[PDB]
Copies of this chain bind each other. A is one copy, B any other.
Amino acid sequence: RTPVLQSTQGHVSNFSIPASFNGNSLATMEAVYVDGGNAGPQDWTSFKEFGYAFSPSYDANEMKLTEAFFREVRDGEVRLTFHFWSGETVNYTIIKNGNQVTGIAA
């Protein structure tokens, strides 16, 4: 099953993507720049750290991307891949300008 993600506009300090949880449990998230390169904390991997960089908020139907995550994102466009306990992946695009971030669902 693939319940899934809304477009949104937010701030780097408490950015949340509205998310229809009902379905799945999140396993991990990758982040890469559009034109290649791992994005976010730990440049040596595309896969980010649960809790530190991102965390699902099942009660609130939100995916949080933390401020620590955005500290390691160069202004621009980033594609996120959310991996669930299979079912299956879900892409999402984020555009970061300074403190502003726009999120675009696939």
Contact = CB atoms under 8 A, between A and B. Distances in A.
Instruction: Count chain B CB atoms within 10 A of each CB in A50, A60, A68, A100 and give the residue with the most.
Output: A60
A51 B100 CA distance: 8
Instruction: Count chain B CB atoms within 10 A of each CB in A14, A66, A68 and give the residue with the most.
Output: A14
Contact of A51 (B11, B49, B68): B11
Interface string A23-58: 000000000000000000000000001111001010
A55 B10 contact: yes
Contacts of A75: none
Contacts of A14: 52, 66-68
A57 B13 CA distance: 10
